[PDB]
Symmetry: D2
Subunit: 333 residues, 4 copies
Amino acid sequence: KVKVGVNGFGRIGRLVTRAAFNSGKVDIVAINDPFIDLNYMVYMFQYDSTHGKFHGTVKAENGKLVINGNPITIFQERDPSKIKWGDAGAEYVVESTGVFTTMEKAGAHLQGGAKRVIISAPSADAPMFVMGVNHEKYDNSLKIISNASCTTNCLAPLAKVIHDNFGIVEGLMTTVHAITATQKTVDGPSGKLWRDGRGALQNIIPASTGAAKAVGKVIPELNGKLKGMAFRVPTANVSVVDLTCRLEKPAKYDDIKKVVKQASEGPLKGILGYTEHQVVSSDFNSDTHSSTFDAGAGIALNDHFVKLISWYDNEFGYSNRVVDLMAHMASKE
Amino acid sequence: KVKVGVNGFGRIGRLVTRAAFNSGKVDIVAINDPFIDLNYMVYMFQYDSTHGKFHGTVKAENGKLVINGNPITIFQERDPSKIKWGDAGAEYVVESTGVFTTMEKAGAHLQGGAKRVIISAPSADAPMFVMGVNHEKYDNSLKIISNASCTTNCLAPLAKVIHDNFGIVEGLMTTVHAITATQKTVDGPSGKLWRDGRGALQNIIPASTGAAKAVGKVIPELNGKLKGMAFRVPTANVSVVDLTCRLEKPAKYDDIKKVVKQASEGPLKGILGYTEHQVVSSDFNSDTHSSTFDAGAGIALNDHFVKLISWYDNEFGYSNRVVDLMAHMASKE
Amino acid sequence: KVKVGVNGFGRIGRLVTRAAFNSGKVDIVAINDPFIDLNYMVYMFQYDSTHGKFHGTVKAENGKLVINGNPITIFQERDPSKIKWGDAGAEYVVESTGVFTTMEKAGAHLQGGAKRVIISAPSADAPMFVMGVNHEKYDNSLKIISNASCTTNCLAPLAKVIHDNFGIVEGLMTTVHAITATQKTVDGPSGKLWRDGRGALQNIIPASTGAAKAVGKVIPELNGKLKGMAFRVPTANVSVVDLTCRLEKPAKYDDIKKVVKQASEGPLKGILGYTEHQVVSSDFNSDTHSSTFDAGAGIALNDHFVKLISWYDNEFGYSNRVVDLMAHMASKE
Amino acid sequence: KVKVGVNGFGRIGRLVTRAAFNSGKVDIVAINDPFIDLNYMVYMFQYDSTHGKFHGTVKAENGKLVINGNPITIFQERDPSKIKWGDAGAEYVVESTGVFTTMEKAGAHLQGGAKRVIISAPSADAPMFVMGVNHEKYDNSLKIISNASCTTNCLAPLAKVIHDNFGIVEGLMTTVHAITATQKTVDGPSGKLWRDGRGALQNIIPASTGAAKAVGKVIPELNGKLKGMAFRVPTANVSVVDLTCRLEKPAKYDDIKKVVKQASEGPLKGILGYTEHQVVSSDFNSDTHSSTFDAGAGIALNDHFVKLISWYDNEFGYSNRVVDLMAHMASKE
Ligand SMILES: NC(=O)c1ccc[n+]([C@@H]2O[C@H](COP(=O)([O-])OP(=O)(O)OC[C@H]3O[C@@H](n4cnc5c(N)ncnc54)[C@H](O)[C@@H]3O)[C@@H](O)[C@H]2O)c1
Ligand SMILES: NC(=O)c1ccc[n+]([C@@H]2O[C@H](COP(=O)([O-])OP(=O)(O)OC[C@H]3O[C@@H](n4cnc5c(N)ncnc54)[C@H](O)[C@@H]3O)[C@@H](O)[C@H]2O)c1
Ligand SMILES: NC(=O)c1ccc[n+]([C@@H]2O[C@H](COP(=O)([O-])OP(=O)(O)OC[C@H]3O[C@@H](n4cnc5c(N)ncnc54)[C@H](O)[C@@H]3O)[C@@H](O)[C@H]2O)c1
Ligand SMILES: [Zn+2]
Ligand SMILES: [Zn+2]
Ligand SMILES: [Zn+2]
């Protein structure tokens, strides 16, 4: 029902667009990307190495991108403040370029007529929200918000269930993460983050992520109680979280399984998943969950000290959450 | 000085041979592998996808594998007890087939004239040793010993330094593991371990490992205080250990760095490495250390709860330890 | 209508089974595989790293494999002559183990009551058939036949069109081929084919193939006019043929495009594909064509000397052809 | 002996620097790169995912990059005309940024006092040279030249031997090429070349290359008689050429082997290699040859129609040729 503009037609931009048209929860009416012209958008959206060919129709007609018969205005602006979202009827803008993550930078979309902006990444100052965890804390005074990172959306739902039931005194997270567009095919320049410049195909690359720390924002009680890091590895998609945490109340591993499974079947349905199957990463490709608990993979040293494993399609899960978030916001208007 | 025989000419058998000739600490004089004839041995030893072409000469001559002008007797016996080690002058035998890990089976080499047997893998009932950790516990009454696994050799030296200085109350370990020969190119049968059957190129694959528990043996005080698991990922060589542990005594991260660096420069020199460089996995290709502490990659939530990162060439490092162990044994004769 | 048994429930076995339930052209009533028990078959069939989770239902009940409600008898015989195909009602047997490719070896299935056998690979003496090329040469007197290789099924339909219109004087073919189950994850023993033993993730591996020569069997006029080789590269699925040939009659590239596109829409519909899109290998994953001509990728030096490019899902395309051929065989009974 | 400056410290820039110091054929005295400061240069040059840690010393001292005790002046100029090559003592300048490949653009280095410029890539207008083929056609009047491409340097030497002995009537080339810096980790924008934007790890990507056509310039007699294309595949380094050519004079394959081997041991020593071993791509990592003929991989349909295979380290071979070319220029001077 809410009309949506997308800034940055990349992995997230394109898959948010897919999620939108597949679910019908929001309507994409405009897209901006200076480095992808209209004809190129048809090809990039239609064919996808990771998630296969788009199920539906896409073509260019009269300057518009037409997906499933729905025309979309196409902009080619480098400067976000110059995009005429208002003229196109875009009420919400998905900010998914990755270079406008502050409220100041993302707020440029308001000058073009956008009413609200959703940053598809962590923000230094924008309020972050995770569906199933704190999305009800949103209110209509917030015109610029963040949907956090893919990793945060994996960790937070799980952390909520564990904290709600047993309490997390302290925890340390590792994520084995699929490669992304920011990495390099071969050893190349990355002056700010030297390790991230090394060849992505050849290397396990340790990386710093504020994902664990970010969970402290969407779940205030866990503020300062979580830290983590990442290992980037040569897979095209799907990542996994490794949460090692100390519980303040005792819990058998079966108790943990029970409460997680219960959550996945109820209040966190579609967000937090649960499995006992012998899964590997490819089994979660195009899976729309934010987080899927791997029961068989976890290990318990004692009732107070455990390692919990959760899978996530970093591309497809997060993209769907962006749509869910916007659908929820629209319902409050 | 001591003469060595090698049963099995796989990744380990061949790299023990390389380490032996490169370091010159021992002399290979016999090899046994049914599935590999003499001409093929030259090829497999000379050319290596991971560690490159051998530095030195290798050729067949008079039915002998000649490495660096040193002839080596070859055997093709499927039954270990049928190998004439004594005739070829082999004092120590490196059992590296991986199917004779028990005291009974491994002892078969003795029947042939072998004086001592070194198992290059975990054993269910043979005394396990890790250089730098408990190798001084070796005495001359032991005829059949084990050098534990590649991962145990990475974790134990670090675990020793941390335990000796601050005391590990408890710890959970993750290892991001490069692919191995037991895995499959595409989804194939692995009846006992279903996840391991899945395509190695396509998947992050969780897997069980007894490395953390094995540290309990070589370091008795840590018995029952460590366990862990693995994630197999599509990289060719070099793995990494992720140890999340609670400490009883306070330990600022700078104090951890100090004691590990101190250990790397003194008693554990050559075994436990230390670095503050922005390293990735490939930087440890053909690194001979059992384990190299990654200072920049580790994180501390507080003085009692930390995540410690250590790299290892799961092939090269371990193979050299086997040679080092044999050299230590020879010095005790 | 015709009831089918599958020997060897591997990549081709499982995908032949998928193709059969998806097309409905035949009925799978029995499967044999000593190294995959009933419960394991459920897992291997349901989850696929390459082609995704099975669309439909699969489970074990009453000792039967039940797919979409249809019970399937499961055998665990190593000896082909000991499988009770007749009792299970299997009339045709798909021989897809890779180790019974001669008529003598494949004929063992007749002892257990099978009526005809279709070898899912090249055979040294069994008549080879390729859908769209020579399948109409099949007749009821042939009880054991071969569906050739994936590569042959790609090249032959293309070569047919080119020869029919312009005449191939001579040709040389290269196939850039995805990895398969026969390859190794790391340098391992392969005494018969040394290069094939080398790690499949790290290397481009030149390999021999009789695919081009086999086209001379299914297209007799081209006997002795074609030869080729292969490069194995680190991708999980989908391969491509590179055909360099001399033509007898003048052929503008636009004329080649015309006749190939004509064929793809007419008599070779569903077997030979045609595209002008900017495609890469993943765009053909789970594509059912035997061969898809890549218009933009090909090049013409002159009217008589050209390089033609054709893509194929080596797993999925070939598997459907096996089902197609069996349905055709049944039509001739 | 000749002092050299390097513009652009990328894969080629850095590996030309390695080649220079390893061979000692020229002296690097200056380097320019706006996107890599002094400290970062030390790291990027020392550590290399593909060719391992640099064998020697590297450090920053007094604003200089010091390799093996040799100080090197560092510039950070975006505009090549502003680089004081002269003051730094650099006579020749290797232009290896990939964005100054024209004579007008590369000529900017002369304004800074450089005497000659070698473009480490094909040029639209600068004369191209390939060591072993037409380097003797270089003369002192030429201030701005090109060393062509890696692929041209692989194909031309081979083409020379074949054309000289048997005459190439016509030929078509395919190169299976390892990934490069211009490719993307995941589906991303590549506006002028759509296929090159697709994920490099996931895809076999067909691509255009003027390598075969370029051979016609370094070998005038073959002008218009060759063309080709490339398949990009997910390997970090080492590529292979596949030359399918028709010959005017009869040539048994043994005769082809003979003349190629003969050249590898004589005038083309170090440029054109010859092997009959069962090699795979990784065996040529850090191989300094421009082209190594794979005797066992090639095939002949008849005495006039053959497919010849040749390997090349696209990074290391080319870099050493840049140095050889400069050394040759200096010998004339
Ligand atoms: N890929 C993931 O798994 C993932 C998951 C969660 C969040 N994110 C975050 O989403 C954001 C985008 O990530 P991505 O993977 O889609 O990267 P991407 O490179 O695939 O896409 C980003 C793009 O935005 C375009 N762009 C660049 N500058 C622009 C500008 N000034 N104006 C408009 N468009 C511009 C680019 O052409 C490109 O298409 C990042 O912040 C990322 O951290 C990514
Ligand atoms: N993978 C491809 O792309 C492709 C394409 C065309 C043809 N083929 C051919 O099909 C055949 C199988 O190929 P694949 O890729 O499925 O190999 P695969 O290894 O994936 O499966 C073959 C199997 O047969 C089973 N098996 C082994 N011995 C058996 C026995 N005595 N009895 C019953 N089952 C047994 C194995 O358990 C395994 O499941 C081969 O001949 C192959 O050349 C493969
Ligand atoms: N990589 C190969 O295999 C190969 C083989 C043959 C030829 N080449 C050619 O060599 C050239 C470089 O290729 P590459 O593989 O090293 O890619 P690369 O990305 O690694 O190197 C290009 C670089 O030059 C730097 N640079 C960019 N703009 C600059 C500027 N204005 N001034 C100074 N430095 C600048 C960049 O920091 C970067 O290091 C290309 O033209 C390529 O076609 C590459
Ligand atoms: Zn039932
Ligand atoms: Zn028919
Ligand atoms: Zn010009």
